[PDB]
Amino acid sequence: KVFGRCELAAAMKRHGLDNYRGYSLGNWVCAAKFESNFNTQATNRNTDGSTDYGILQINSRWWCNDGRTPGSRNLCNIPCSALLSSDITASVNCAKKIVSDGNGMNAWVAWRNRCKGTDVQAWIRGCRL
Ligand SMILES: [Cl-]
Ligand SMILES: [Cl-]
Ligand code: NA
């Protein structure tokens, strides 16, 4: 599923992401835009053989099991394919665990490079929340 911007903002808000660990809704929408272009089916292979999955590009080395990342952990206790669903529930619940692990949203390289320190409220502007 390819979300609209306001559609994703509303779905993330309903799943508890607005101000989660102090990160306003605009940060999460900005991250999803540059991680996946709002596409729940996005995958990308990394150099170490891990793969990033879904609308927030969650990495198989630490967070989900894809059966092909040897010596990886599965800290969200899900198959990585669950992160590709049109229902973002699994991605959001895993994201909540990642952002809580000490490094905040710096875990997402696109957020660090393209959202951090910008006017992220622009990403939810005009949406009916
Ligand atoms: Cl915001
Ligand atoms: Cl933080
Ligand atoms: Na894994």
CB 95 within 8 A of CB 58: yes
Under 8 Å CB-to-CB from 22, ≥6 apart: which residues?
A: none
Name the experimental technique.
X-ray
The string of DSSP codes covering 110-129 is: HHHHHTTTS-GGGGGTT---
Ligand 1 mean position, distance from CA 25 (Å):
5
CATH top-level class of 1-129 = mainly alpha
CB 44 within 8 A of CB 55: no
CB 57 within 8 A of CB 50: no
Ligand 2 mean position, distance from CA 68 (Å):
31
- Phi, psi (rounded to 5 degrees) for 109: -60, -40
CB 46 within 8 A of CB 72: no
**Is 87 annotated as belonging to a binding site?**
no
Pairing of strands 43-45, 58-59: unpaired
Instruction: Tell me the resolution in Å.
Output: 1.8
48: annotated active-site residue: no
Residue from 7, 48, 52, 66 carrying the catalytic annotation: 52
